[PDB]
Amino acid sequence: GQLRHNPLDIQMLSRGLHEQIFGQGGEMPGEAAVRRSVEHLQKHGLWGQPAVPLPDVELRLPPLYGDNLDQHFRLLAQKQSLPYLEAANLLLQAQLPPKPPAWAWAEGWTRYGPEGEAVPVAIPEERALVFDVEVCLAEGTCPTLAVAISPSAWYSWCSQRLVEERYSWTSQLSPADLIPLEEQLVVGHNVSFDRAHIREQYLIQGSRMRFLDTMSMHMAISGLSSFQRSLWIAAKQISSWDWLDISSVNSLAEVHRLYVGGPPLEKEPRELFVKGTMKDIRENFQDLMQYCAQDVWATHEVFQQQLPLFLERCPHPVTLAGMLEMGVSYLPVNQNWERYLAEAQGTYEELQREMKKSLMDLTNDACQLLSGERYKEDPWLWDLEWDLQEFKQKPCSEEEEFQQDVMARACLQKLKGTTELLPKRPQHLPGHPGWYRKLCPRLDDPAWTPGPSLLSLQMRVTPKLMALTWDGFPLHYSERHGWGYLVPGPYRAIESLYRKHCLESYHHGNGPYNDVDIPGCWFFKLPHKDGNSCNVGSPFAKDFLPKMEDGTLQAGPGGASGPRALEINKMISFWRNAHKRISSQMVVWLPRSALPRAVIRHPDYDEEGLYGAILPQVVTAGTITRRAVEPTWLTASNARPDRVGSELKAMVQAPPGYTLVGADVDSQELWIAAVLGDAHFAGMHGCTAFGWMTLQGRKSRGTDLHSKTATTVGISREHAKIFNYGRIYGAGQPFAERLLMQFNHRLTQQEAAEKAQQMYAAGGTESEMFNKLESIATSDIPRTPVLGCCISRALEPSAVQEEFMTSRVNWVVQSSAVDYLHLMLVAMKWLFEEFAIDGRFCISIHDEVRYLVREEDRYRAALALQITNLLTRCMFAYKLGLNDLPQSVAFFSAVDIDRCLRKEVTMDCKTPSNPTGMERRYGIPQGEALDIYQIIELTKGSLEK
Amino acid sequence: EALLEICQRRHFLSGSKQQLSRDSLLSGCHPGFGPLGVELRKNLAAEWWTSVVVFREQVFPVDALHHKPGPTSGKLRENLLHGALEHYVNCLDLVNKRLPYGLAQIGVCFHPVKSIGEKTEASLVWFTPPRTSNQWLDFWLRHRLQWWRKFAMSPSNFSSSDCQDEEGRKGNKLYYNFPWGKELIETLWNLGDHELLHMYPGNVSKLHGRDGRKNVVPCVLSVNGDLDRGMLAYLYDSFRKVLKLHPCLAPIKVALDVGRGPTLELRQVCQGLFNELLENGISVWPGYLETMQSSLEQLYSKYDEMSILFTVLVTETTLENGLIHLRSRDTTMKEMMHISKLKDFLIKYISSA
Amino acid sequence: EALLEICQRRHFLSGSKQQLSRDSLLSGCHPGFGPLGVELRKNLAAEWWTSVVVFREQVFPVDALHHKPGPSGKLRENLLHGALEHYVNCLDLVNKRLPYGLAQIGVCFHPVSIGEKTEASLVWFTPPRTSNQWLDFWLRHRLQWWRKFAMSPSNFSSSDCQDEEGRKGNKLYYNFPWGKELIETLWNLGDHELLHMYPGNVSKLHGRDGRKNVVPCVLSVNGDLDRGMLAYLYDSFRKVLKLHPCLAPIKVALDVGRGPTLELRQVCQGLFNELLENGISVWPGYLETMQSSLEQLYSKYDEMSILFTVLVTETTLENGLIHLRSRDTTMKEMMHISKLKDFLIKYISSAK
DNA sequence: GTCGAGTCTAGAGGAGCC
DNA sequence: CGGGCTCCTCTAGACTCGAC
Ligand SMILES: Nc1ccn([C@H]2C[C@H](O)[C@@H](COP(=O)(O)OP(=O)(O)OP(=O)(O)O)O2)c(=O)n1
Ligand SMILES: O=C(Nc1ccn(-c2ccccc2)n1)N[C@H]1CCOc2c(Cl)cccc21
Ligand SMILES: [Ca+2]
């Protein structure tokens, strides 16, 4: 039968699939190993508990090449990366003539032959290049000029927005406004910026051009952590410091120094392309072109040094193939993108005005404390600047009425000329106090609005203006210790307010800080969610909403003024920090000619609508764990009912005739850690208590580790993710207690501590995984257990001895997860190319993969994704040598098939800026989440057509 | 009730206390609005006209008569929607038969109370394609609520409710939370083509509006606000006894005064400044023409109750150096600015508000 | 007659062609006004307000209702009665001083059918000694205001008349092509009405004139803003309605000449928003696709009393030049786009 | 030539993602 | 001993520069 079990009674894979992944002949675990596993499981009280068998799956998988799974993946990745390694080798051997002395002032592409001449060309027409793009930030996101290095010649490009000057250029970018190019490899430093400026990249159909990044390879070879970058910059200007000499920050100058050495790399002192205007660029064309040539030459010289070191420390072809596939992200958009930007900005402005109305009102109503010097009796605003300045100095007939009008006009016309005794620029609100003055926009300010329009909840004066009290004590700010409050004991006026509050140190908290020396009062810091060592920067944080609703934090005006202020702050906190990124996103709109015929002919095609794309500017390896990095799309918030503009990802909408098919891995790092611990203890699945708990439980049934923790301690499931992954990678009991108190408001100090030890109870459940991680991390050259990729030279034990231990131990599992992502991308590309599944890679977040599939091939894409997950899990098992895979983790829980990017297929993104919803406003129906059996039924268990 | 006391003291309202009970104001049986009441209502109508008609390429004014002739004796109009529906076909030719387009009007309507209550109402009949009718209704609900909250010191007191007609037609109702309760200030209805088809029986080709590339009969969206109760709403929202109406709504902008002496020259200075601010669209209260000449504190309180934005004080020193004093109602603080830069700033403070 | 056809066609009036007649326009029984007619009436009312109430502290606005309750009410027939009712309580505005006036614009209902007319009225309370002088002063100012916007101010006339009682009064006319019609009337009505409305204890009607208390005299200045609009349409009438710049409803016609449509529409929309923020009314002719001939567009805008027709073309994106055409003179000039708003404001101010 | 008003970085606390 | 990232606003100290 297809039902199979291990010596420890865990349902393994179906027989048909096992005969195709592992074949036959794997070594039996042995009696001693099984006895040890049974003893461990019985000791932890986990033996003898049956589980309902999951239904068997019978699949005819595509023919796997080679003799086993590793050879299969190697062959796939070598076929993927073979031409691009050839292009890199071409860039690694050829020698280049020196840059020409006189650049060409021409529109288009220019090729510099020998003796510095300039020849007009249509495209660089080279397999391998080093590319750099210069963009004038004053004219928007259109490229300005670019210099490209070929293994044979120099190349230069200039936009028509540089050669020609016109009154107005289109704000809506088009492919014709981009840099023309196009089996090609393009190398650069932060190539994703330069990829975004290539004309042919925005086409919906894919292109064979791939990109290699110097920051990514630097992070792969000699990269630095964020704390490491801080320490390195502090030093360039722990007991281990040998890592400094073999590492650098991602800046091109620093990387060139690290790898190639030689004379220092110099930057343009004026920074024209960021601060200057187009006239400056036309005036200074030669200098800026020479600087671009210098940067591209430095990048070429750095790539020459990095490529062999990268191929040495990361020898598996899957790593390079995945890094090539991870850098071709693609996000399609439409006119709903413009509507979303407009609506989100409008909602943000409306809420901003609503909050500033209350703000300005109270401030304008506090100026009366100046009259009579009454601010000394105000418990809040006594410390501010109340001093005032001075203004410094250096019937009638028709004829009678006309004459009187002219005389009354001339009387002031004489007075209108006495301006000679006044300064050129008038003093700003000389009469009002200094505090009021600072909060009013100056008259010259381009955007001027009447009143204290420069006031916000983040200002250090706002809580005093709104008279916020914590347990009835006025909030007081200490520069050394952040925010806080004053317990009495205007000290006379502070007690009077507290006495009134009681009608409507004896107080225990963060202790009376004696440094503040406020007379007749004590200082207590506001309880911060991350402990007593941290300082509060603003009482209007999200963590203070429960305390405001409970009434321990109160507003002076009372009523809903305080809670509404905190609610509006929570609504606009994301947009306030991300609107510059989201609004400025480089959107390029495709004309009807460049669109595919499927999009044009589809019923949902709109003749009056726009269709475009956003290429995420992804740093492929921007992490010591070799993760991707993106300022916007890797920080894009999920749709929440209270957050303005949080439907950002829902605006990534497939064109007509297309859908987004993707999935997210389930308990990825939990399973990776458990399988490592299992392979360390005995060569079976479920040997350890942690591995048995991980396997025993389904996400649909709500019994997995995250859901079990959420039920046990009461927090949400994402809060349980934070809790569990913190505990795995180093969080102590105080961290767990603080996280529980933060995410579960009903718990007390004692109750949270007890529920921490319940999750921290376990010779233990988690012993073997910890031992394996600490053994690999302390190895002479730590490497990924699956693809064998080495750690950065800055984190090896020789470079850092007994330092950054948490970073390395977490690096093991996290870089293994990156290996998982590389394997998934490789296998998905292989299945898409082999069976002609029309589609392409859309975007990957650190454990999610999205594919812009055509409508007719959504279920084939779903089956391909399930097969990919199956093969990747079996590869993880095979490298560790377990020679089996549980049926519990063989496939995805569900594959999302949606027309927009959202966490759940059923949730509707009803946010303050999107109150109607995606269905009512933009006409986006709900998607479907399908597990393995449903996909098998829909596609007959085959990827063919 | 102190608000109505101050309003009748400062000529926002008329009559005695008997006619100024809140029931009389709400019903419409009060006498006419006072002069400052006329100015405040004019400012509300001007802001409404700006937002709805001025900045939109497809909203046009319409002249609907106050009486409904014929079926034997005629009647006074109760709503402005009927005349706009009568002008629908005529104004279809302006937008070249392209939907959506609107017909806006501010007028007086007569509601039975058997007394007659007169209400000034601002209407927008917004012909829309049937498919996007709910979208346009939600857009107009949000726009109108934002407009009412734009001039509000407490925008939360302006609310909306989703209501259904006795025939099941969708609609929304705006409100202002008065101290006594929650009164209706505006109403939107997605009427449909019922009224258009009833008023224009027979062929429907004349009623067709070109939505995109297809002809369609518009679904009438009726927006109707109460500018009298809206004026009362803003008087309550505004209300040291100070109104604090909006700078774009305050009836009288600038109060102009004098100093010590010489009287004759300062009179000429004030006359020139008065004419300047008048020619620049800024309404001025000539306090220099008063003969009683009370103290500064009494004038300050008097002007505070009248929602006076600024108090210009031309003293003798305005002759010497051209500097004039200015007190702001917002903060009760005095500042000095030159006589050459008063008009430009006043235009700035108002426009940017 | 052709002017009425133009007004109906260009949305100055409303209703069917056979529905609009001279008598129905003079009486108040016409269907109403088109959007251009409504805006011309608003312009006339704003000019009347500027020339009467805006530039005089002594003149205040009032709010008289349409119906008079009590002895089963009826529609108001004139704006005088409400002003006389408001006379007593309005003395606190002037601190019981004298003279002072009350002015208003509103619809007055006249039996004919029910005729509605937009009548602009001003009542002037004065001591009887200077009553004739104030009457002559107001007559001068009103005739100056009427002739200010006129292409041919000879058509506006003035006359002297006596009522049945025998009080001095003037009648202001406009010489329509069919004959002179009453567009305004001034009467020195005395104190009969004020005493009849307020009998007994005349101490409440005393006005201070040099510390002397006087029961005042009322001057009635009743114009016809609807007949004023008709007079200006007739006087302003190649078919061109050369309305005065301060009265013409829409000033600028903004259009698109070439492609690309997106960029030209963008620059036209920016120009539209700029001109609107600067108080200039613009006809958004750039929205229309498949435009007619430029000559036909010029004729249409001339019949609509459009001051200037601005055409934005492909060249505008290159340098900023826009084709500018004037209503009064059929002369085309090219001006930079950034200088258009200041030019329009300057032209409006100059013709004022 | 003195000193006070604009510009500029650096650091700290808050807030999105996995 | 959570880890790996990303960016923002606000405040303070130092520098520049210009007008009197
Ligand atoms: N606070 C967090 C969040 C995430 N991760 C890491 C561990 C996860 O394996 C990976 C992906 O995050 P998910 O939130 O997707 O975690 P799971 O994949 O376990 O959850 P799910 O089963 O819902 O996908 O990121 C982490 O270490 N700490
Ligand atoms: O709202 C504002 N904005 C601003 C911003 C700079 N400003 C300025 C204006 C003139 C000279 C200097 C500075 N003004 N100012 C109000 C608030 C306080 O009161 C007044 C008064 Cl008394 C007079 C004028 C304006 C105001
Ligand atoms: Ca996951």
Numbering used by the authors:
A (entry chain A): 67 to 248, 263 to 317, 342 to 498, 532 to 626, 648 to 662, 731 to 988, 1051 to 1233
B (entry chain B): 67 to 137, 177 to 218, 229 to 354, 369 to 482
C (entry chain C): 67 to 137, 178 to 218, 230 to 354, 369 to 483
Task: Show sentences the authors wrote.
Mammalian mitochondrial DNA (mtDNA) is replicated by DNA polymerase γ (POLγ), a heterotrimeric complex consisting of a catalytic POLγA subunit and two accessory POLγB subunits. In addition to its C-terminal DNA polymerase domain, POLγA also contains an N-terminal 3′–5′ exonuclease domain that is crucial for proofreading during mtDNA synthesis. More than 300 mutations in POLG, the gene encoding the catalytic subunit, have been linked to severe, progressive conditions with high rates of morbidity and mortality, for which no treatment exists. Here we report on the discovery and characterization of PZL-A, a first-in-class small-molecule activator of mtDNA synthesis that is capable of restoring function to the most common mutant variants of POLγ.
Even though the A467T mutation is positioned only around 9 Å from the compound binding site, the structures of A467T-PZL-A and G848S-PZL-A are almost identical to the apo structures, including wild-type POLγ, with only minor effects on the architecture of the binding pocket or the mutated sites. PZL-A binds to an allosteric site at the interface between the catalytic POLγA subunit and the proximal POLγB subunit, a region that is unaffected by nearly all disease-causing mutations. In the presence of PZL-A, we identified a novel density between the POLγA subunit and the proximal POLγB subunit. The size and shape of this density enabled unambiguous placement of PZL-A. PZL-A adopts a C-shaped orientation owing to a stabilizing intramolecular hydrogen bond (2.7–2.8 Å) between the urea and the adjacent pyrazole ring. Furthermore, the urea carbonyl group forms a hydrogen bond (approximately 2.7 Å) with the backbone amine of G588 in POLγA. Further structural analysis revealed that the PZL-A-binding pocket is predominantly hydrophobic, with the exception of a small hydrophilic patch near the polar urea carbonyl group and the chromane oxygen of PZL-A. We identified three residues—L566, H569 and W585—that are in close proximity to PZL-A. The two hydrophobic residues, L566 and W585, support PZL-A binding by flanking the compound on either side, whereas H569 stabilizes the chromane group by contributing to the hydrophilic patch. Substitution of the three residues with alanine abolished the PZL-A induced thermal shift, confirming their importance for PZL-A binding. Addition of PZL-A had a strong stimulatory effect, restoring processivity to near wild-type levels across all mutant forms of POLγ tested.
